[PDB]
Each structure stands twice: as structure tokens, then as C-alpha cells.
Amino acid sequence: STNLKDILADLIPKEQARIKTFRQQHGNTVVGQITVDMMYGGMRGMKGLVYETSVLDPDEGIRFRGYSIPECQKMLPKAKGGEEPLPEGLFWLLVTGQIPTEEQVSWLSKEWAKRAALPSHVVTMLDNFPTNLHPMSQLSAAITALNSESNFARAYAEGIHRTKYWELIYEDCMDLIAKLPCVAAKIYRNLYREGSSIGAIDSKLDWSHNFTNMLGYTDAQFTELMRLYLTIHSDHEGGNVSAHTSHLVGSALSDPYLSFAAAMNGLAGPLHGLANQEVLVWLTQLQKEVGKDVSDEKLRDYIWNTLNSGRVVPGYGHAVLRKTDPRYTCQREFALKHLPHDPMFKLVAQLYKIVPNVLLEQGKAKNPWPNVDAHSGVLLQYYGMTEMNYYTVLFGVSRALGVLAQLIWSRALGFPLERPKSMSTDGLIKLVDS
Amino acid sequence: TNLKDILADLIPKEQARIKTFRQQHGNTVVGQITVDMMYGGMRGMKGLVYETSVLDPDEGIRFRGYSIPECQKMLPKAKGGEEPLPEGLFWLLVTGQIPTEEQVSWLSKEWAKRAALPSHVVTMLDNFPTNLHPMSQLSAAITALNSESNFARAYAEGIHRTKYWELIYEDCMDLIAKLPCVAAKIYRNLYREGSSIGAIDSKLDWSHNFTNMLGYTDAQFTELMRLYLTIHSDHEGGNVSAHTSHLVGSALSDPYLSFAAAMNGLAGPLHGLANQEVLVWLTQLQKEVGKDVSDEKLRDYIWNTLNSGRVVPGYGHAVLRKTDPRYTCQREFALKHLPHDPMFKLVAQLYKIVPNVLLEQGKAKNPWPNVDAHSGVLLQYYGMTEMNYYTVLFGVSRALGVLAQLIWSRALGFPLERPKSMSTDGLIKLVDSK
């Protein structure tokens, strides 16, 4: 009823059966071809894995177990007196496929507060990291070191039946999610608040609120932003590097700590984790050059000048998505309610009406609408969260929810070791000649 | 003797060859993708280009076209030694060329010069508790070593895409150099009461500095280590450690982050524990039947094992049609240096008996042993009995292959790895649409 684990125990056999039926019906049905270009090109366009928690609708944007972002905003439980969806309820939805009740979210908030403690060796290690060690490296190293606490690792080594793997994977995922804001807040305070204490967990608060308390923030509106931010960055299919790395490493039966830490090393890559920062840097330099209320007319000229000089507008454009990312829209709606006077947000809003038509006229970008990363930095900055290097850590804390929800299911459903076949160029030349 | 200049000459030629091949054959189909392949971990799917090694299904693994016996003959040895130096294997993987004596000597000196650890990493290692698994210590320390990444710093400043390989190469060389220091510290802190690893000797080869740092002095253990580190170096790109390094590397994560992620995958029980599983099984077998077991008695034990539905660890392969050449070279080593060892004699007796029984049974298609059937007994003979640590040795070896390929992935401009995921619901819809 409220124990997520019991709810999961009931859902798993039904899903195992549904999948077994589909595979017995269509296991050898062809769904795609592999080309030489896909092998050289990073598996671009190759259907390669089953990932249940989220799917991109090319007309509507990312869906979380079939629900759109606006649906999740309406349906997922809120904090008392709040309006933004709690990430606990997003996790419940990703794990169960079901919209949680108020009572189920409250249960989950309590679980995550109970589980949050860090072992002293990890606290020591965090405190000892130097300030030139990137926050993402601190994050990954600390999570790897937390595998000392893995009950899956311990139990597997002792011997456990394959039908029970998901049970201990679930426990370790719940524990890791619980601990993440403590780890992330320690990194933040050690780097940017002179090593001050993160303070204590409050058993009566939701996850995002314990997090903002530990970061040293007190603004109710920042906690609301954080609830929205952590919900909306939570998952985006399995093919992105962080999701896929967690999946791949997980498929070797590495525990959730090892799997998530590997994923963070992928998220740290400049081609995956830096879009928010790139946008904010660009907005900041623009606003310093043209000032805080440039006309629509003049801003368009600035954009053409940017593009005519060979540069791109950060945060705009998508290969597949045919409208504005719904994750951009929800951030826009938040800003219109809560910070409509802010000069940097007003620039972001002006760009939304100007940039898409310029990109369409230019004729290079496909689908020139903005994405989530076009809007996040200005909101963080408004609330005082200005340390851009740290922004990927926030993304990582969010993305734990999606990738660990799927990891539970990968183990419940018995997905095997991920093992594509590699070939050399010599080998491919031989193959295609045969 | 500058490996980097030799690489600079080879790179354009390969880039051109690949461009020409892809012009004609980019759209050529090399396989079909089925529903079962997606659920089954990409089993059978040709999904990536990995240049350094290729499995010949008749003969076993080849390193840039050379067999293991060819490498044993042709690769340079230490003065007064018989086993191939891993330095030369790395040279071969990077260049496709067999190094001269002088080139290997140069590379030994490079790796001795580059070995230094920053204080924070030494401290972190010394502070790890004894219940943190050696593989977790390894990955966490390598992640923290990214403070030393020159690629990370330079990329943030701006590097032209055609030159990424240059600083990737420098960081790989640095990481290889530092790995034995990290690994030896873990060993001594866990198993030698925190005693000092001592200093690097600039006149010694990599394996010898490593065994010195581990606290071993037996000349034949150093010989074993040279062979072990050469033979475990690479085995195509589809294994989890190789693929994880490739995936993470494709996001332009530096070699420290990419290798650390790879180690979290190698740590998984389905990838890095085969040596240990075999040795555990052999130990129990020897306790049950004793050291003087007749061929007749052992044969009966094997039939009984198979007739009861159980498998012999280390024996059997889906594709390889004969004994793994990595098993053979270890057998040859044991015959020269420890033929009297009782556990080796059991390993040798099983080689005589197990494949015959599997062939008579007629179910297993390729009844021959792999590398992991033979490695534990050699390590144990020399006093390296700490089975949890064995995967660290595998990881130090595998650095050579995955980092040789990482250089080439960047030199050739391989893009972000991004296959497409689908949900079960999505696949049902896709199949029904067609």
C-alpha cells in the first residue's frame, strides 16, 4: 500500500510476463539494420537497448512512463503549500508506472530522510579533496567509495538467487538517492562555503528541501525551483551517455554505487554535461555588451551577427523534437510567476521570440526551438547559485532518479551483460568484400 | 624513438583510408537488429569500431594482427628475461609496428619519468578503509587523478578537433605511468600493513618497478607479471571495460575519467571475477579429491559434475574453437617455473581430462579453456593469494589496450556514442506499425 518495495514486488511478475509474451511473439522480428556508418558514427540511429522509464515523443517532448511534463506538473504530489512536483513522486512514477498518492510520496520522503547518512570515511575523503579537483570528480569518487555500503555487492559475493537481485538493487538505489544530496552539499560547502557544516537531515522534510537546507539556502522559492529542476532533468531515454553508462556498467552486475559513479564520469564529459553553463556564459557576455534592455530589433541584429560570424546560438535546435522542449516551457512559466522583473530572464524571454525564425531563415539548424539548457542557468543564478562549475552536479543528482529507476527494472527483468561486437577497419573491409 | 611522432605520421593515412572506405560502404548493411537483440544486451550486434585487437575464431586474440606466440617471439624482453615487456605490446597496439629494443627502452624510461602522484591522491589512498574493495579504491583514485589531466584543462581553453589526440596521448602515457604506483599502494595498504611502496627506479621496466612496489623480489614473479600484463591487455571493444572506456571517452571525458569508469565495469562480477571463481572451485576440488587424484577418479568427478547439470569454470566458449592462446602461454610458463606446484598439477590434469569429457558428452560446442582457467594458480604460487586484488592486476593490464584505442578514437574523430533506446511499449508499437 505505501511500501514501494511491496508495490514493486506485485508489478514485476506482470511486467516479466508481458515482456516474455512479446518476445515469444516477435523475438526474431527485425526492427532495424546496422550500417558501416553506424559503427563509425557512435551507433547513431541504431536501435540498441531497451530502456523503460522514458521515451522522447518527437511531437511533444520527453514523456515519463507515458506522461508529459505538463501532466506530471498537474498530477504529481506537491509539498504542502507548494506548486512544483516533488521528485519523490517522479521517482515513484518512473519505478511503478503509476501516479503516486499523497501518502505514498510522504512515505518515500521519510524513507529517503532515514537512509541519508554518510560513513565517516566518505566524509573524510570529501573534506580532503583539494579545490582544484573538479566537483564532478569529487562526486564520482565519493559515490565509488560509498560502495563500501552496498548491500547488493556484499550479498552477491555471499551468494544470492537471481530472482532476488532486484531486491537488494532496490535497497542500494534507495540508499544512494538518499545520500546524494548529502554528498553533493558537502562538495558545494567545501568548495564555495569555506568548508562549513551541511547540518542535519530533517526527517519531516522532502528530499529537495533537505538538499537546499544542506546547501545553505533558505528561500522557499529556491526549494520550489529545485523540486522542479530535479523532476525535469531526471531522465531522457537510455541512449544519452550518463544513462547508457549506468546501464552498461550495471549489466555486469556492478552495484548501483559503481554504476552511477561511472555514469557521472560520462556526464562530466564536455559533450554531455556542460550545456547549461555554455548558455549562461553566452547570455552573460551578451548582456554586458548590449546592456539590460536592448530592443527586439537590436537583439535580432546581434543574433545574425553571431551566426554570420560562424557561431551557434547555445540552447537552440534539435535533430528530432519538433517544438519547444517542454522542460524549457516549465522553467519559463516558473520565471513568469516568480521573477518577471529579472533582467537576465527578460533577455531569455526576448530570445525565445526572436531566435527561432532567424535559425529557420538561416536554414542550417533543424528544429530551432530551445531546450532545457537554454533556461536553467538564469534561474539558478537568480537564487544565488552562481558557481557554474557545480551545475553538472545538480544535473547528476536529478539524473540519478531516472537511471536508478531503470537499473531496478533491468535487474528485475534479468537483462544480460551488454556485449555488442566490435570490428576493426581491416575486419570491416574484409567483411564487406565477402 | 618518439612514439608521438610516429603516431603523427600514421594518423592521416588511417583517416584517409577510412574516409575512402566510408564513401563506398557507409550505407552497407552488416547486420539486422531484432527485438531479442535489444532485450539481450546487443548480443550479436556489430556496433563499434575498435582497432587494436580482433578475435580470430580459429586462433584466438590477435594484437594488431600478431598472435600471442608471435608477440612472445618478436617483442623485446628485459635483459636476461624471456617474457615480452608490456611496453612493447603498448607500442604495437598504438602503432601497428613491432618496436625495436631501443624504442622499448625509451618507453620504459618515459613511464618511469611520468610516475609521480600528487599529495592528495597519496593521502586518499592511505585513508581508504580496509573494507573498501581494492577495485573501488582503484577507480576512486584514478578519478581523483583527473586533477592532473592536461586534456581536460586544454579542452576547456580550446583545442582544435584535429589535435585532441595529442593531449589524450599525453594523459594516457601519464596514467599508465602512475597506475602501478596507485595499484601498489592499494596492495600494501590492504595487505602489508601500510608499508611504503618505495621509489621508482628509472633504469627498470614498468612491470619490474610494479613488482618492486608490491614488495615482491622473486625474479620469476616479475617475469610472470610481464607476461600477465601483456596478455590481458586487450580483447576487442565489446567487453564491458573496453566498451565503457570507449563510451565515456566519446563524450570527451579525459583518460582518467574514462579509465576509472571502465574499472567500475571491470569490477562487475560478470566481467572481472572469472580468475577468482576458477581458483575457488579448484581449491574445493583439491580438498575433496586430494593431491594424488588418478586420471580415472578425476574423470568420474567431471562426469558427475556435468551429469548433475553443473559447469566446469574456465572451460567452454561460444566462438573460439580451440584453447585460448592466453591459457597456453600460462601453461608453458608453469611448466618451466612451477611444474611441482600441486594446484598447477591439478590445473594441468583438468586440461587433459575436461575437454575429452565435454567432447564425448557432445553438448558444449567449444570445450577448451580460457585465460581465467590458468591465472590464479600462478599468482598464488608466488604468494599473491589475495583474490579480491586479482581484478586490479587485470585492470592495470587492460589500461594498455583501452588507452591505445582511446588515442585512436580521438585521432580519428569518433563521435559521441549514442544508440537509440526504446521501451517495451515503443517496440510493441513499432512492430505493429510495420
Ligand SMILES: [Cl-]
Ligand atoms: Cl540527457
Ligand SMILES: [Cl-]
Ligand atoms: Cl575481456
